[PDB]
Amino acid sequence: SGFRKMAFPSGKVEGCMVQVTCGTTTLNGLWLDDTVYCPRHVICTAEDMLNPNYEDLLIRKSNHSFLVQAGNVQLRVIGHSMQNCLLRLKVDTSNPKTPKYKFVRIQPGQTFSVLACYNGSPSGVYQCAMRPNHTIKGSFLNGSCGSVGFNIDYDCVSFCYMHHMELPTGVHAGTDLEGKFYGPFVDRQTAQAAGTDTTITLNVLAWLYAAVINGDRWFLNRFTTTLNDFNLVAMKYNYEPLTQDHVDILGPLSAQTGIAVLDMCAALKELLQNGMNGRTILGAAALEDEFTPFDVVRQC
Amino acid sequence: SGFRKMAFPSGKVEGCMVQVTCGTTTLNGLWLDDTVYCPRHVICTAEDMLNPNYEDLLIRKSNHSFLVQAGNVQLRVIGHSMQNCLLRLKVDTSNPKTPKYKFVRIQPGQTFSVLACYNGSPSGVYQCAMRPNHTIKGSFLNGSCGSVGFNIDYDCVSFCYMHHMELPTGVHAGTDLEGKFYGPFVDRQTAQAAGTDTTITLNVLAWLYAAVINGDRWFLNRFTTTLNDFNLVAMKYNYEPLTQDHVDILGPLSAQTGIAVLDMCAALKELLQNGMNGRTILGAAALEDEFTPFDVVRQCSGVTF
């Protein structure tokens, strides 16, 4: 009955991780059935990343150029095709561990589990949220490229992210499982930057509801607010504006705590204005926003 | 790379999770080769939790009393025996997913990952620490009893925790995989409470070396301290006394940054006396105490399994 940053169990994804090498470059690939997805920049080398032409680089590559490996075993790549920023290699072996899966594109503010990898082997798993500026603040040392974010519903894995690169600020950028980047980024060593990021207002409130559900109700107050006035304040603090939609989503949690949503806004409003009094919420000494209402409901 | 709180990949432990039932009581079990480990209070029903005689209740228990399930399939239990607060069920089938493994008892301040399960099916994995008062600030709903905690080494899974129960505090308590409780707790619905917690000073130091490694180093200074002086401060802020033995466990991290342990203590000392000044460390508004010296080497030196 506590509150941990939880990830989905990583098992189904672990049995999908492989290693993909081209010359001196190695990163991670996701092996599903007879297909291996990985970031297309596994083909660039040195003075390529300096704006390269992937069509041009790919056409010059042969199926034997790709050294794919599941543990000891190489897998024979018997075909390929680019799809936006991914490579979709074909192989002569099917992965018997392939779980029920689908590809989904995820909205900013949502969360997922990341199984970080290096040379095809799992290092660790962790939960995070897609920032509103489309970056993710993960733990990603060079070589982790091709790690995947995923969600798990019952038996079925929804892949939503593959890591590609780190930005200057030190945050990370990637694509869905169809090669589409998240955010206005390109896989080239051109100097790009993160859009400004806001705090995920919807998540903070869910987190605050999770505090209450756990016997922590010190931040609560008696006043209320309109949606209008809460936004006027929250946006001053670089919080994302709040929509009636966001309010409804908080419906079940309010029902469960008895605390009205705008009242909880009134609480957050006060927390934003008046520091935090050195007090802690769920052990945190700042406000958390990498928890969705779904998550809170799930864990609590 | 940022710096997150990572759990170990849970696949190998997922492969050993099962469902154990005695009448109405359904919890989780750990299936290794032909043994299933679960908390012995699975035998209890209702007010048996109120100080029960496990020795006598079990004497009346018969093998087929136990309903053990992996996925849809039933695992025939063909024998049982108690080991402190655990049941050891014998089954007719060796677990084909049994990983290389061992049991170890963990010490206060050490960390590990928990795979929280329900009806023998995993729901989530997270990273927590064994508190100084011998509790764990976990996340458990009812049904999670039998959920296990582990660390992985190369290929070898080290099981160190099996969840039994929650305290009035909202914290959690359970055993090593030999049935031995952590701290002074017994598996009975009686009146037990956790002692006051302290901040795991060793870990906070590790967390600070971590920051430095990531180039987050605004908090260092050109000064040092003694154990005694650092301890006279720490203890005012409810930090655990740092021992010479602790100092040695930081050796790898102090060598990799070339910053002496006592030199970092002096910086910690000043963080305590002067707060953080609105600034952050690894983006955190506060000091982290649940990353071990080991966790850091691991996560900052891309170690896989």
UniProtKB/Swiss-Prot annotation, chain A:
Changing D248E: In strain: Isolate BJ04. Signal peptide: none annotated. It catalyses: TSAVLQ-|-SGFRK-NH2 and SGVTFQ-|-GKFKK the two peptides corresponding to the two self-cleavage sites of the SARS 3C-like proteinase are the two most reactive peptide substrates. The enzyme exhibits a strong preference for substrates containing Gln at P1 position and Leu at P2 position. Residues 1-300 are cytoplasmic. It is found in: Host cytoplasm; Host Golgi apparatus. Residues 1-300 form the Peptidase C30 domain. The active site is at H41 (for 3cl-pro activity), C145 (for 3cl-pro activity). Cleaves the C-terminus of replicase polyprotein at 11 sites. Recognizes substrates containing the core sequence [ILMVF]-Q-|-[SGACN]. Also able to bind an ADP-ribose-1''-phosphate (ADRP). May cleave host ATP6V1G1 thereby modifying host vacuoles intracellular pH. Exists as monomer and homodimer. Only the homodimer shows catalytic activity. This is 3C-like proteinase nsp5. It comes from Severe acute respiratory syndrome coronavirus (SARS-CoV).
